[PDB]
Every structure is written in structure tokens, then in C-alpha cells.
Amino acid sequence: DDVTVVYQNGLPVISVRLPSRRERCQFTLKPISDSVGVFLRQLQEEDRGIDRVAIY
Amino acid sequence: SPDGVRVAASTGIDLLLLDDFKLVINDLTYHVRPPKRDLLSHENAATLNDVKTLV
Amino acid sequence: QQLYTTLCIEQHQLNKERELIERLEDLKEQLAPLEKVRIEISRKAEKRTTLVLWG
Ligand SMILES: CCCCCCCCCCCCCCCCC[C@@H](O)O[C@H](CO[C@H](O)CCCCCCCCCCCCCCC)COP(=O)(O)OCC[N+](C)(C)C
């Protein structure tokens, strides 16, 4: 599995695999109104087994 | 999504109702099929000519 | 409402205010060299006005 970023309706959709159920999940990002830490907060809200997140 | 990937809880409803989806409630998966408009004749100057004719 | 979503109008409005904020904070970029001269000129003009008042 990869992490795929595509564009739908002018917004980026990023499809990442969550660990606790091992099913993918797509996140719709807003390129102006949103930040990195709100994307990581949504990523920890979707699955509670994502205690450690980082982005480099 | 109909491909099988989950849809995160920050996705708006207006982005969700542009395609089919599946709704899982406890263990039953209901295949929701919303009434969608066309996307072939959805050139925006024609959709604005529909809004102009209706108003 | 199905045109407000497929044309991505909310990001267009936020792009518009981002353009306005950038134009405002770039008009304040070429002003800060000039006020360093203007404050000097106004200071050494008030320093000569108080001379004729006390005179
Ligand atoms: C630049 C280098 C420094 C120079 C330092 C030397 C300064 C030399 C002095 C120059 C004087 C300029 C200031 C003028 C002060 C005079 C005050 C005047 O009021 O005295 C009157 C006496 O009159 C004076 O003899 C001259 C009258 C003024 C006519 C000349 C005008 C000079 C103005 C030059 C521009 C400078 C700006 C003015 C600064 C206030 C008596 O008061 P009063 O009778 O009860 O007036 C009634 C009050 N009103 C006006 C509000 C109704």
C-alpha cells in the first residue's frame, strides 16, 4: 500500500491506511484554510491507535 | 466510498452526495444512491442558462 | 448549491482574501524605508518650530 494524493473538485484527497482496522481512509484537505496539525488531528480522530504521528 | 475506502468525518455532506456510498450502521451495509444531476451537460454556462430560465 | 461545490467557491473566496492580505502587507513593505526619513524630517521641523515659539 502507498499513500496516494489525488485531486477531486479542486481539493486534494489523500488516502492513507489506518493501523487498527487495516483499511484505507481518504481525507479531503483544504489548501488555504487548513494546516498540517489539523490534518494530523483528524488523522488521530479517525483511529485511536495512531498515538504517534509525525511529518517530515 | 463505493470502491471500499472509508470517508473521514471532516468530509462535507455536499462532497459526499455527488456519488454513491455505503452506510454501515451495525453490521448491515446499505448502498445509498443519491439522486444526482448530470455531469455531461453540466457545462457551467448551460447550468446558468437553466438557472436563468427558471428564475 | 450543486454549483457552489463543484466549482470550489469557498477556496476561491479564501484565495481572494489571501490576495487582499498579501497586497496590503506588500504595500506596507515599500513604506517602511520612507517613514524612517519622514520621522527624521518631522522631528527636525518641530525642533525648529519650538524655537520660534520660545523666541
Ligand atoms: C528660526 C530660528 C529661531 C528664531 C528665534 C527668534 C524668534 C524671534 C521672535 C519671532 C516672533 C514670532 C512669534 C510671534 C509671537 C508674538 C505673540 C503675539 O501674540 O504678541 C502680540 C503682539 O503682536 C506682536 O508684536 C506681533 C503680532 C504678530 C504679527 C507678526 C506675525 C509673526 C508670525 C511669523 C510666523 C511665526 C509663527 C507664529 C508663532 C506663534 C500681543 O498679543 P495680543 O495682542 O494679545 O494678540 C491677541 C491674541 N490673538 C492673536 C489670538 C487674537
Beta-carbon count within 10 A of A49 CB: 10
Q: Is the CB of C34 under 6 A from ligand 1?
A: no
B39 near B26, Cβ under 8 Å?
Answer: no
Contacts of C54 (CB under 8 A, 6+ apart): none
Cβ distance B15 to A28 less than 8 Å, yes or no, reads yes
d(CA B33, CA B55): 29
What would you measure as the largest C-alpha separation in chain B, in angstroms?
Answer: 46
B21 near B2, Cβ under 8 Å?
Answer: yes
Q: Is the CB of C52 under 6 A from ligand 1?
A: yes
The DSSP code sequence of chain B is: -TTS-EE-TTS-HHHHTTS-EEEESSS-EEEE------SSS--HHHHHHHHHHH-
Give the technique used to solve this structure.
cryo-EM
Cβ distance C7 to B14 less than 8 Å, yes or no, reads no
The residue whose C-alpha atom lies closest to atom 40 belonging to ligand 1 is C53
What subunits touch chain B, counting only 3 or more CB pairs under 8 A? A, C
Cβ distance C5 to B14 less than 8 Å, yes or no, reads yes
